[PDB]
C-alpha cells in the first residue's frame with residue numbers, strides 16, 4: 001500500500017485472476033488424453049503460470065484494484081519500500097548496456113576515421129577490431145568519465161553549421 | 165611570389181554558405197592570376213550534389 | 229540447323245571475390261559509399277540487369293540463371309510445406325475426419 | 327516571369343546552358359575564372375523554372391539560381 | 407576463402423549473425439528463466 | 448556572314464501521319480513555334496509530340512506549341528544526328544521572331560560579343576536580408 005495499492009500476495013483479485021487463467025487452461029486440458037503430447041504442454045503451461053504467480057507474489061509487487069502488478073518508478077518510494085528491482089535496478093542494468101553499445105560504436109568509428117578510406121570498413125566491418133572493441137569496452141563508464149575530464153568526449157566549434 | 169596555400173596543404177573553409185563550412189579539405193591547386201576564387205580544395209566529404217571540390221577565395225581560407 | 233544449342237564454355241569464373249565488393253555490377257556503385265544513398269542504390273539497382281550492361285547476351289544469361297534461383301527458392305518453399313505437413317501436422321488425423 | 331540570376335562563383339564550365347531545356351542561358355566573356363567565360367540569363371521570359379540549370383552547376387552553393395516569380399503562359403509551359 | 411570471410415564481414419551478414427546471436431541469447435534466457443517482470447534475486 | 452535568317456512555309460514537313468499531340472488554339476490565337484533544319488539523308492526521328500517521323504533530304508519545317516518542344520527536337524537532332532537546326536516564333540498576325548541561336552553560335556559556346564544580362568557581381572551568400580527589401584512596391588526577392 002504505497003498509493004492506494006495492495007501487495008499481490010494480499011489482494012484477492014490477483015488470486016481470482018490466477019484461478020481464471022488456470023480455469024481456462026483446465027477446461028482446455030479436459031479434451032485430451034492425460035499422457036498425450038498436447039496435455040504435457042498444457043500442464044507445463046500451468047506450471048509456468050503458477051510459478052509466475054508465485055514469483056510475482058514473492059517479490060512484493062503491488063497490485064491494484066484490477067489485480068495486476070504495478071511498478072513504482074520513483075526512487076525514495078522504491079528504495080524506502082523495497083521496490084528498487086521494479087525500475088531502479090533495471091534503469092542502470094539498461095544504461096550499462098546502452099552506454100556500452102554507444103561506447104563500442106563510438107570507438108569503432110574513431111578507430112576507423114584515420115585510415116585510407118573509412119567507409120569501406122563501415123559496410124564491411126573489421127571483425128578483429130570490432131571484437132577487440134567489444135571485449136575492451138566492458139569498463140565504459142570509467143573510460144567515459146576519464147574522456148569527459150579531458151574534453152576529448154566533446155568536439156569544440158570546429159563543427160559544421162549554417163548561418164547563425 | 166606564390167600567393168595562397170601550398171600545393172597539398174590541409175585547410176579550413178570559412179565560407180558560411182558552403183557545404184564544407186568549418187570543415188577540413190586538401191588544397192590541390194591555387195590559381196596565380198586575378199581570379200576571384202583561386203584556391204581549389206578537394207574534400208573526402210562530398211556535398212548533396214555529389215561534388216567533392218570547390219573554388220574558394222583567399223579570405224575564405226585558413227590553414228589547418 | 230538454325231535452331232540449335234549454342235553456348236559459351238566458362239564465361240564467368242566462380243569466385244567469392246566479387247562478393248567482397250558490393251556494387252561490382254554498377255559503374256557508379258563500384259567506387260564504394262560516401263553517402264547512405266549508395267546502400268539503397270545497391271539494393272535497388274541489383275536486379276536491373278538492363279542498366280548494368282548493354283550486351284543483350286549477358287542480360288539474357290543473368291535473367292536465365294536468376295530464374296533458376298527463383299525456381300530453387302520455390303522448390304525450397306514447396307519442400308518445406310511438404311515437410312511441415314509431414315512432421316508437424318494433424319494430416320494423419322485429418323484424413324479420418326476431414 | 328521567373329528570376330534567373332547568376333553569381334561570380336561561376337567557373338565557366340557551361341553546364342547550365344547544356345542543361346537548360348529552354349535556351350534561357352548563354353555563355354558570355356568574363357575574366358573572373360580560368361575558363362574566361364561566365365553564363366548569362368538574357369531570355370528569362372522563356373524560363374519555366376524547372377531548375378535543371380542548378381542541378382548541373384558544380385559550384386558549392388550554386389552559381390545559377392532560379393527564383394520562382396510570376397507565371398505567364400510561357401512560364402507555365404503550356405501548349406494551350 | 408579470404409574473400410568469403412570478407413563477405414562474412416559485410417554489414418547485412420554481420421547484422422543477421424549478430425541479431426541471431428542476441429536473439430538466441432535472450433531466447434535461451436527466457437527459456438531457462440521464465441517471465442522476468444521484476445529484478446528478483 | 449551570318450545575319451538573322453528568315454523563313455518561308457514553302458519548305459516541306461517531314462513525313463508524318465499526324466498525331467493528337469499537335470497544335471491547339473494557342474497556335475491560332477497566341478503564338479506557335481516553327482523549326483527548320485537541313486537534313487543530309489532520309490532518316491527516322493522521334494517527334495517530341497509522340498510518334499516517329501522521317502525527315503527528308505534538304506530543308507524541313509515543323510511546327511510546335513512550346514519552346515521546350517522545339518529545343519527538345521534540336522537537342523535530339525544535334526546529338527543523335529549531328530544536324531544544325533534553328534527554330535523561330537510565329538505570331539498569328541504573321542510576325543516572325545528568330546529565337547534560337549541569336550548570334551548564330553549555339554549558347555554553350557562563347558561568341559565574344561553577346562551581352563551578360565542578369566549577372567550579379569557578388570556571391571550568392573552576400574545577398575541582403577528580406578527585411579532590407581521589404582515594401583519595395585511589389586513582393587521582391589533579396590537577389591533583386
Ligand code: CLA
Pocket residue numbers: 432435436440441442443444
Ligand atoms: C521499451 C519497451 C519495453 C520494455 C521496457 C519491455 C520490458 C520487458 N519485456 Mg517486453 N516487449 C516490448 C517492449 C518492451 N518490453 C515489445 C515492443 C514487444 C513486442 C515485440 C515485447 C514483447 C515481450 C514478450 C513476448 C516478453 C517481454 C518480456 C519483457 C520483460 C523482459 C524479460 C527479459 O527478457 O529479461 C531479460 C533479462 C536480462 C537480464 C537480459 C540481459 C542480458 C544479459 C544477462 C546481460 C549480459 C551478460 C553477458 C555479459 C552477455 C555475454 C556476452 C556474449 C558475447 C558472451 C520486461 C518486463 C518478457 C516477460 O517476461 O514479460 C514480463 C516476455 O515474455 N516483452
Ligand code: CLA
Pocket residue numbers: 271272273274275276277
Ligand atoms: C516476374 C516479376 C518481376 C520481375 C522479374 C521484375 C523485374 C524488375 N523490375 Mg519489376 N515489378 C513487378 C514484377 C517484376 N519485376 C511487379 C509485380 C511490380 C509491381 C509492384 C513491379 C514494379 C516495378 C517498378 C516500379 C520498378 C521495377 C523494376 C524492376 C527491375 C529491377 C528490380 C530490382 O532490382 O529490385 C530489387 C529488389 C528490391 C528493391 C526489393 C523490393 C522490396 C519490396 C518492394 C518490399 C516487399 C517485400 C515483401 C513482399 C514485403 C514483406 C517483407 C517483410 C520483411 C516485412 C527488374 C527488371 C525497377 C526498374 O526497372 O528500374 C528501372 C522499377 O523501378 N518493377
Ligand SMILES: CC1=C(/C=C/C(C)=C/C=C/C(C)=C\C=C\C=C(C)\C=C\C=C(C)\C=C\C2=C(C)CCCC2(C)C)C(C)(C)CCC1
Pocket residue numbers: 073074075087088091098099100102103106144
Ligand atoms: C533516478 C531515476 C529517475 C530520474 C532521473 C532523472 C531526473 C534524470 C535527470 C537526468 C539529467 C538532468 C540528465 C542531463 C543530461 C545532460 C547531458 C548533457 C547528458 C549527456 C550525456 C552524454 C553526452 C552521453 C554521452 C555518451 C556516453 C558517455 C555513453 C554513450 C556514448 C555517448 C557519446 C552518447 C527516474 C525516476 C525517471 C527513473 C528511475 C531512475
Ligand code: SF4
Pocket residue numbers: 330342345346347348349350351372373374375376377378379380392
Ligand atoms: S529554369 Fe533553370 S533550367 Fe529551366 S530554363 Fe530557366 S534556367 Fe534553364
Ligand code: SF4
Pocket residue numbers: 335336337338339340341342343364365382383384385389390
Ligand atoms: S553555373 Fe555551374 S554551370 Fe552554369 S556556368 Fe557557372 S559553373 Fe558553369
